[PDB]
Design a protein around this ligand. Structure first.
Ligand code: MG
Lengths: 321, 50, 147, 100, 79, 235
C-alpha cells in the first residue's frame, strides 16, 4: 500500500543523567538495522562538538620524560586531558590557562572562569598532585571539529612547523562517549515479529543524550533534504484531460476475443476497426452470408461486456485515421 | 587445474573474495571463500515433524 | 460467554487472542526435553517466547547440556499445568539454576566453538596493525575507535 | 544441473527408467506436455504395420514416499533424436542428467 | 520476570519447603483472593510470590502466625 | 565551515542498459558516504513499489497441478514465467489483463491485449510454446501494486474468493530492483580535499525509474527519520 509504519517509544531511561537507554517500537522488517547503523556512524564520526586539542607545558618537550611535582607520568596527564568535557560558544577555537600550583590534586575547577566557555564537570580531577612544593602548571587549547581526531593527522601539523605550541594529543570532538544499537523482535496485534530498536548511549555530559540523538536526526534530515520527494507528497494538485470516447474504438476488431470464423467474416465486410462497428446496427450484419447466431451473439455479448452498444451516433470519426 | 580454471575467468586465483555486510555495510577482514555448491533438501521437513 | 464461544474464537484465529497468549505465556515456563536423557540435564525448564515458523528455537549454549546436535534432532516440550509444578520448574528445573554438572563441579555452561573462536580472534593480537602503539582512555573509547 | 558432476550422472539418468528414453531413433513429430509422438526413421522402421511411437509422460502422481514424480518434455519440434536418447526428463533430471 | 532464585536458597533452608511455602502463598493469594504486599509489574502470581519470599516479609513461621490470627479473627467475627 | 556543511545532489542518471543503470550523488563531506550507501541499499532491497502478478485465471486448466493439451510446458512453469515478467501501471493500481494466442510458436508477453495505462517493459520474455496448431490459450492475469512481498497461501482473507476453481494464486513477489551495489570515490571541489562522491549501480526489472526509485527510498527514509526527529516522552 506504499505506507510504512511509525514507532512509538515506551522506554526512555535516563539513569545517571548521562547514560541513556531508549527504545523504538515498532519498525519494518529491516529498518531497525539500517537506522541503528546510520545513527552509530553519525554519532561516532559526523557529530560536531568541542574537546581539548592542544596542550602547553613549561619545558617537558618529549613524552618520554617526567616532571617532578606529580605522582604520574605525562601520559597520564594527557589521558586525563583527553576526557575534559568543556563546551564553547560560537568561537571557533579558544585557549585556557592553568597557571596554578599548590599541594592538593589539581581538578577541572582550577581553570580560569572564562565566561565564553564552560566546563561540564568542574570536580573532575586533572592530576593527583604531590603534597609538597608541586610547582607545575600548563595551558590547554580547545577547538571544534567533526569527530574523533587521532594523532596521525596531527603528525603532519607537527611536521609543518615547531613553536612552543607544537604538542600532540588526540581530540574526541564527538560529544558522545559510547553508543550501542541492538535489534529485537516486536509483536504487532497481527504481525508477529518486527524490528524493535534499543539504543544505549553515554555522552561526556556536554549535551543531553536525547539532545544528541535529536541533533543526529536533524543533521541526517539536512543531509537528505536534497532528495525528500521535492515536497511532502510531491503532487498536491490533480487535473484531468481525456477524450470524449475510449481508444478501444480505434483498436482493430481482432481485439474483441471472438472466434476465427466470426473475425474472418467481419473483416470481409471491411470492418477492421471497433469504432467502425459501434456506429452501425446489426440489420446489415445478417445481410452478409455466414452470419448466424454464433457470430452475432458473440459480438453483442463482447460489446455488452465492454459496455458500449451496437449502433451509436457520433460525428468525430475517424480521429485521426 | 582449478587454479588455471579460475585464472581463465576474472575470478581471483586464491578463491577467496572479500564480502560486505548487509546490516552495518562494512568490509569483512580475512577475505572469506565463496563458491557455488550443490545442495540437497532431505525428506525430513518441519511440517511432518511438528 | 461459554466454552463453545471461546473455542470458536480460538479457532477463528483473530487478533484479540494474541495478547491473551502473550499474557498467559508471560511467566508460565515450559519443560524442554531431549529424546535420549542420559542424565537429569536432558529435561530443563524455560520461559517461552513466541517465534515464527514451526520449529523450536533453542539457546545455542544449552544444547551442550543435552549433547543435542542441530542435524535434525526432535525435542519434546511439556507444560506443568499446576501451580506447584510451575513453581517447582521455576525453582529447580530452570536452566539458570542448573549450571554445574551432577557428576563434576565444572560448569555445563562452557562456551561452544563459535563464541570461543570469536573471542580468540578478538584477543589474538599481531605486532603491527592500525592504531599500533597509541594510547586509549577507556574501553568505551576503544570500542568507538574500533567501530 | 549440478555444476560439479562426476560424469556418472548421465549414466545413472539413462539406466533408471524414471525418464523417457527413445526406443527407436527418429524425428520429432508432435510435442506435448503429456504425449510425445515420434516418427520412426524408415530404416529403423518395422517392415510391416509401420507407424510411429507415442510416449505418455507420467504426470503428477503419488510415489511410494508421497513425493510428486513427473516428466517434462525436453525436445523441440522436428528435433532429430537417435536410439537410446532421452526424450523427457523425469523427477530430479535435466537434459538427461541426474539433478537432485 | 524472575531469572535467579539463589538469594531465596540462601534465605530458606533448602528448596523443598521453599516451594511449599511458595505454593501455599500462591494458593492463598490467587485462588484465595487476598491482597499481596509487593508492587506488581502486570505479571502472574508465581513471580510475585517468589519476590515476596525473596524480600523476607513472608515465610513458614509468618504464614503460620498469619493463618492462626486469621482463624482467630474469623471466629471473633462469627462471635 | 566545520558546521552546517553542504548537501548531496544527483549529478547523473546514466543508464548503461535498459534495466541496468547507474546514478551518482555528490558531494559528501566524510563518513556520510558508506552510511548513505548502506542506508539506500537496505531501503531499496527492503521494499519498493512493485507491479507483479498476484493471481491468474485460465479457462482450460482447472488447477495448476494438471496439463493442457497443446502447450509444451507445465502449468507450474507457466505460473513461474508469469511471475518472471514485469509490467508498469500508471493510472490505476490493480488491473486484469488478458493473454490470448493461437497457432504454433513461442508465445511471449507481447501477445497480450495491452491497455493504455499498462505497459510491458520487455516483450521478448517467452511465456509458453504453443506446439500444437489447434491450441488456443486464453487467460486472465491480475496485477496489483503493493509494498514489499507476500506469499501465496498467507494472502487469503476468506474462503469465498477461492471458490472459483480457475483462480490460480501465485506469490506476488513484486520487486522492481534486483541488486543494488554502491561505492564511494573522490569528489570534485574548487579548493578542498577528502570530499566523497557516491555511485550506486542498480540491476532492476526495468519497470521503475532509477531517479524515481532513489527518490522514493529517500522519502521513505525521511519519513522514518521524521518519526523521531523531535522525539520526546510521547505515547
Ligand atoms: Mg542429531
Amino acid at each position: 500500500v506504499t505506507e510504512f509504519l511509525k514507532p512509538r517509544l515506551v522506554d526512555i531511561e535516563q539513569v545517571s543523567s548521562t547514560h541513556a537507554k531508549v527504545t523504538l517500537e515498532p519498525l519494518e522488517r529491516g529498518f531497525g538495522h539500517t537506522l541503528g547503523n546510520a545513527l552509530r556512524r553519525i554519532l561516532l564520526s559526523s557529530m560536531p562538538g568541542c574537546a581539548v586539542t592542544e596542550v602547553e607545558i613549561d619545558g617537558v618537550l618529549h613524552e618520554y620524560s617526567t616532571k617532578e611535582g606529580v605522582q604520574e607520568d605525562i601520559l597520564e596527564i594527557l589521558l586525563n586531558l583527553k576526557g575534559l568535557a568543556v563546551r564553547v560558544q560560537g568561537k571557533d577555537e579558544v585557549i585556557l590557562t592553568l597557571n596554578k600550583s599548590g599541594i592538593g590534586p589539581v581538578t577541572a575547577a582550577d581553570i580560569t572562569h572564562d565566561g565564553d566557555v564552560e566546563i561540564v564537570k568542574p570536580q573532575h580531577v586533572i592530576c593527583h598532585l604531590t603534597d609538597e612544593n608541586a610547582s607545575i602548571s600548563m595551558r590547554i587549547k580547545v577547538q571544534r571539529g567533526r569527530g574523533y581526531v587521532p594523532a596521525s593527522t596531527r603528525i603532519h601539523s607537527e611536521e609543518d612547523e615547531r613553536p612552543i605550541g607544537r604538542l600532540l594529543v588526540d581530540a574526541c570532538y564527538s560529544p558522545v562517549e559510547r553508543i550501542a544499537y541492538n535489534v529485537e523482535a516486536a509483536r504487532v496485534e497481527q504481525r508477529t515479529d518486527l524490528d524493535k530498536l534499543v539504543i544505549e548511549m553515554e555522552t561526556n555530559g556536554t549535551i543531553d543524550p536525547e539532545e544528541a540523538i535529536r541533533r543526529a536526526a536533524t543533521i541526517l534530515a539536512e543531509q537528505l533534504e536534497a532528495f525528500v520527494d521535492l515536497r511532502d507528497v510531491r503532487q498536491p494538485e490533480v487535473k484531468e484531460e481525456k477524450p470524449e470516447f475510449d481508444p478501444i474504438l480505434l483498436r482493430p476488431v481482432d481485439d474483441l476475443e471472438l472466434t476465427v470464423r466470426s473475425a474472418n467474416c467481419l473483416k470481409a465486410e471491411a470492418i477492421h476497426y471497433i469504432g467502425d462497428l459501434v456506429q452501425r446496427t446489426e440489420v446489415e450484419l445478417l445481410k452478409t452470408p455466414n452470419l448466424g447466431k454464433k457470430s452475432l451473439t458473440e459480438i453483442k455479448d463482447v460489446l455488452a461486456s465492454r459496455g458500449l452498444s451496437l449502433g451509436m451516433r457520433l460525428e468525430n470519426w475517424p480521429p485521426a485515421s | 587445474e582449478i587454479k588455471e580454471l579460475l585464472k581463465l575467468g576474472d575470478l581471483p586465483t586464491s578463491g577467496q573474495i572479500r564480502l560486505y555486510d548487509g546490516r552495518t555495510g562494512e568490509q569483512f577482514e580475512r577475505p572469506v571463500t565463496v563458491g557455488y555448491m550443490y545442495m540437497l533438501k532431505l525428506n525430513h521437513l518441519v511440517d511432518d515433524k511438528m | 460467554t461459554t466454552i463453545k464461544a471461546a473455542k470458536k474464537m480460538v479457532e477463528r484465529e483473530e487478533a484479540v487472542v494474541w495478547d491473551i497468549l502473550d499474557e498467559v505465556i508471560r511467566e508460565h515456563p515450559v519443560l524442554l526435553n531431549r529424546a535420549p536423557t542420559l542424565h537429569r540435564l536432558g529435561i530443563q525448564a524455560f520461559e517461552p517466547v513466541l517465534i515464527e515458523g514451526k520449529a523450536i528455537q533453542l539457546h545455542p549454549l544449552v544444547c551442550a547440556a543435552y549433547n543435542a546436535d542441530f542435524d535434525g534432532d526432535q525435542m519434546a516440550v511439556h507444560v506443568p499445568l499446576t501451580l506447584e509444578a510451575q513453581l517447582e520448574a521455576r525453582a529447580l528445573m530452570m536452566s539458570t539454576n542448573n549450571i554445574l554438572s551432577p557428576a563434576n563441579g565444572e560448569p555445563i555452561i562452557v562456551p561452544s566453538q563459535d563464541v570461543v573462536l570469536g573471542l580468540y580472534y578478538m584477543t589474538r593480537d599481531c605486532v603491527n596493525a592500525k592504531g599500533e602503539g597509541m594510547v586509549l582512555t577507556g574501553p568505551k573509547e576503544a570500542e568507538r575507535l574500533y567501530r | 544441473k549440478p555444476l560439479v558432476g562426476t560424469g556418472m550422472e548421465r549414466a545413472v539418468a539413462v539406466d533408471s527408467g524414471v525418464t523417457a528414453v527413445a526406443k527407436r531413433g527418429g524425428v520429432v513429430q508432435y510435442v506435448d506436455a503429456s504425449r510425445i509422438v515420434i516418427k520412426v526413421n524408415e530404416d529403423e522402421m518395422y517392415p510391416g504395420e509401420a507407424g510411429i511411437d507415442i510416449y505418455n509422460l507420467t504426470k503428477y502422481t503419488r510415489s511410494n514416499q508421497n513425493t510428486c514424480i513427473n516428466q517434462m518434455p525436453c525436445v523441440s519440434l522436428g528435433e532429430p533424436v537417435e536410439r537410446g536418447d532421452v526424450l523427457a526428463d523425469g523427477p530430479s533430471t535435466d537434459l538427461g542428467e541426474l539433478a537432485l | 520476570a524472575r531469572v535467579t532464585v539463589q538469594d531465596a536458597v540462601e534465605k530458606i533452608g533448602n528448596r523443598f519447603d521453599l516451594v511449599l511455602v511458595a505454593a501455599r502463598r500462591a494458593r492463598q493469594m490467587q485462588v484465595g483472593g487476598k491482597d499481596p504486599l509487593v508492587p506488581e509489574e502486570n505479571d502472574k502470581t508465581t513471580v510475585i510470590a517468589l519476590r515476596e519470599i525473596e524480600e523476607g516479609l513472608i515465610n513458614n513461621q509468618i504464614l503460620d502466625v498469619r493463618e492462626r490470627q486469621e482463624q482467630q479473627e474469623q471466629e471473633a467475627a462469627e462471635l
